[PDB]
């Protein structure tokens, strides 16, 4: 289309070009209508010709087969200088058709005979011979197991002809790179599919050329990578080392030659080639791992493999070393099984050399003048190293290396960056040394709390991180709790060290939560002055969370006054903000109270006065008033709902004193501002109190009182689409009733209008609201099931019956309609679940309903199709069949 | 008593 | 596979039908199946059909051609299409008189091939050209042309939306040719019913495809012939049905009435003429034809429902439609009336949507006439002896009537019809079978009649307990059901409770009425729960004497359930002595069986007593605050030794031990917060018995104790001690040869229990010695082909790994995250490897969505670690796959944004092995 | 379905 | 997912 002017070259023009794409995608000789006259659109044409001719494979007649070949052969010859990447699209398009043994049925010899000796057939002949055995059994086109049976064994027979063609390609102007890039990609394919299948490459030109090009310093990155990838392809083609006579030996000696070329590329700092070599080296080791482990230093298990990966892992550019990582993990996972102590022992001298190199790579530049950024590119590299150091130390003994690491700290005046790297490594393997008998853990702990403030920020920061891991050793040795907390207070008071210190205190609080009644006051003073320290959000939340969990473990006598002293700091701020007349934002104070109430959950026996009740009753008015002040703001009201949710949970079984005041205020605020978070909070109240018979009536009055304002808001123009949140949270609340007290809802006048609105909301194209409505329908109908006659099921069976008499037909009808006409396929497993549940309550009633639905459905679709679909659903013996039936049926509209 | 549950249900 | 010799095929065919060893048929069916799936089927079936030696070989061969063409048209080169066509057309001509079963298979084969073959465009006209004028070809030409529109949408057949819509528009274009042939088939041989059947079956098939031009068909005297056959008395069952199905086919095609209106007028008038033919078929008791007409009449009403409702009595809305169905609904054969039912539901439903009172006015007359006819159908024969049966060919019919009557009375007003029904008992001298039919209709609608209209329900209810014992057993049976349905009325009018219970006690004492009386007493217990405190002692005497009444199982269980549900509502003062007197009659029987050592237990099995105690404990759930002594604790602590000793006596019997575990569950559950005094005794005895007899129900009961008490910090340790102590004997049993395969319920119940720990107390299990062995066994158990044991293992793996996701950073997640981390650091790779392996080699596709869930959870915990693990798994995987497919699958899995994308990826990957 | 359904258990609840 | 996740809730547990 001419109006594509903006597309290639502000969205306001390109938005126009884009619209006509989606119109045309679905449509169908008709694409090749361009080039009425050929003059320099052709990108969009060629790009379209790929995807459409691909789809056309399984659409077109067998009439005009060679037309596709000859049109494509013509086009590709005429479009040689557009782009190297368009050639690939066209080559693939040809090859996935040409492979299919109809048409001219032309097996390998045919392309060879028709094209080979034409000097400019080779660029494209190679391109199609490369992709053809690569897209046998392979993606975008469907796998084609039908055709596969014959072909690979003919390509195994003909591979010699393709190798001989490739030898013609190197004599005929193997002078410059683009031809060899094609030759290597082609050879890599016929390697990859194994189809050489014989000993012969010792008597061949191509394999020597491949390695020569890789040894050259004057070679291009393009050619170097295409050759590197060819060598990897050739290594992967060693499916098993001995399944045919070992061309493996040729590839193995070949790669080992590249060490000189490697060392020279690193001296030149030719990094893209250094990376290409480290890949080849790693894929050699991967390809022969089994031989290395089972026959160490023997034949193709030769340990020069690991020795090359050890020189790579020493390269100062960290991007080089982390190539070799997955091989080290894989070597480790093999050693972790076999348990031959020599097949541990030999390799332990290599694993220690790797672990030394990795530890050296963890050293910061001595330059540095801060803490480590954990989001640096070095910071994130450090994590990958850290996680690999963990695994290989676990094969060696975490005691043995934690021992030797600490030895390095306390000898020969270690510079700061060595000291910090050691503390970093030690923090990775702490939490993996045995705590049942290792007093050396106490040495490091003691020796760290006695480290002076004068050492560089990094050494202090990381020793604070290590002190966190060592929280497990603190719990067993609480004489250290006091010194440890002291060391962490001191770090907490320096901005970059503050967050790391907070993490470690939180670790101490969590791990030692039982043994910290004496230390709660220290935490409480920090918690009081939380904002003075300049912590991250996570760090401040972790510090409160910790104080509250320790508070929950105090003696019941102390909690009331300790809880109020935690909260007061936040309660005062809120009281001041009520006296602030608009603009205020209570969010940060509500969210701190929420963390406190979430985690202050003491264990109280029955009849015992729960110690939070007094604090929550004193606080409730300031939160109640905050909610009413900000009642118009949806966000602040959600921050209130979440604070008040945990405040009532904080009071244990004594919730009853607060539940009616909360439910009242929820109804009052919702009645004026229909924020869906009140429906969601109501759903939490129903879920957690609905099984108590005293709460059931109050909660049903709450549902009835939340429904009137809800329905009025959905009745409005575009009310479903405008309030998908409200639909989601309405059916959440109704489903919690069905789970916790179905009979209470089912006796009520409100279940019928909830089910009427469910049927209407089936039409709303919103994935989470849809998911919520369909769950309500499924769960409501499931309360008509009674697979245990010994249950007191009879009354609910009765009341679901009454409800389904008058709305079961309207339900099945709308469900089928919304599948066919309203909503995309994402609904179908959920509708299938609802239909399946209706059948599992009453199959013959369901049969009638689906029947009268199919009759009511709005000529294209045939009465036979309707009746076949009914048959398919009503006789499915599993829910998944209903899904398939309904999907296939849905495609007809 | 439960009859009153019907009364507050009725209005609008 | 080598090609078999043809005499091997012939003896195999002869063994499928005529081997006197019927296992010979197993081996014949199997091996001829392998032949049918094999390559060699094409030639072998062609040769058998060329040889034409017998029916057995020709049936097998034609059936094979069909099966191969539909499934395997792809394994034929395009050059073989017209060869196979002309081969098939040779075979069907040759075999036209051999057997029609064979012709059917060949007709299918030819159609299937014609639909899949696009070269042979216009084939309809070519089949007509070749065979139209030879009268001996018309039988099979019709058979082909009939099945051809039926196989168009056959999902056996591999045709795209494009090609199928091109087929249908071609079939539509040549449909007039096909109709013209059918007219030729009635100028020639139109006097023979065999040819008329084939013609009407063919016409019907082409109507069903929607391709006939209704205007051309209106101009066609072939529909006049079709109606004339339906008017004539002398037609066979088969022709009458073929013509009936054809008229319904013609009606089915014209739902868009306004675009088909000339033919709609002819089908509408044509069906209404069949009234005389219908009345004559009733008079001579020609039930085949009566049923065939009721179907045609009903399909007319179904087709014109909108015209009926929107324009009543006008044009194709003419109410002669309903009047015909009212004629049918009066036929004495109940099989006739129930054809019209789904139309009456559909009409009643449409009226319930369009609340237009001049629609409702008109149709109320029709619905009430039907209601009277349906009500007469509920009358039993006057010479019926006993109660009405339910799971019976008339019992079942009565349910369907009752349901339609219920649904339609809602449109008339349930109280207005219930009033008029009671009037029918009061007025005239009604015989018993009318009186019981009315009580049956009344019982069905009673619970949909309004307790605001109290006076009429009260009169009915009173009169119905005052009727005497001399009344026919079926009236008494049905009255007892009605009394049980009107239980809501007794609750609103408690002066009736005592008379009603009295009425029901008399029925309870009379064996055929007893189970219906019990179900009604259970309703009164349930519904009148508040007023039952005065009547508990009556229920306690029933419970004492329960075996004397000759009740059904569901009647005895309902009665106990009821007594326990009202006991639960007594004052807490009274419950202990009442609960113990309810239980003691069961506890005494168990004490006896503990004393009776000198026998093997059989025929003195404690099952029925344990079951009854379980129902009592299940339902005795009083509302007790922590300040109140729980009144069950006292009773359960006295009974506990009896059950504890029963369990030890029967420790070797898996079933009795299960009945004991089920009783001991409900005993502990019953006692509320006093479970603290009973968990250690229970858990102890469970471990002790399980240590000797590894019944999986102890693992399951442990799972329930973990689910219900794992949320309490005091029980977490005792429950972990239990899991560790149940694991030792469990693992020892799975270590044995085929221990997974032989004990799938042990695997199921072990992972159920481990998963309840993950749900209620995850950090308790994760700090334990035993989590790693449980994962190790989970990884082994991924190999077990058992749907439920698999489902249980994959749930454990999913819910275990999920405890590392921690998306809300405000939760107490850090210690969980760390402990899952340590567990997965040491077993996560081994898990991903076995998951991949078991999809590819071990287990069928039923596992894939569950494995996809586990893999998705591992990615959601830590994706870059997952990437490595799946990679090293794909490397560790043993010419069938290439490195590129491994890498494509890795990429397709690891880039996913929803769980179900992994399902598809893993499935497509799985097909490669 | 199995023995486990007759227990009014988590095995039943939805 | 949504606001609903920041509650230790049935939404979180299932
Ligand atoms: N679009 C609102 C349709 C609807 C849902 N529930 C209802 C109840 C009564 C009337 C209409 C409706």
Author numbering:
A (entry chain B): 12 to 20, 23 to 41, 45 to 56, 59 to 600, 605 to 880, 888 to 922
B (entry chain E): 153 to 164
C (entry chain A): 3 to 880, 888 to 922
D (entry chain C), E (entry chain D): 158 to 171
What does the paper say about this structure?
Transportin 3 (TNPO3) is a nuclear import receptor known for its broad substrate specificity, often recognizing arginine-serine (SR/RS) repeat-rich nuclear localization signals (NLS) in SRSF proteins. TNPO3 consists of 20 pairs of tandemly repeated alpha helices known as HEAT repeats, named after the proteins in which they were initially discovered. It adopts a C-shaped structure enabling it to interact with the nuclear pore complex (NPC) on its outer surface and with cargos as well as RanGTP on its inner surface. One such example is the cold-inducible RNA-binding protein (CIRBP), which contains a non-classical RSY-NLS.
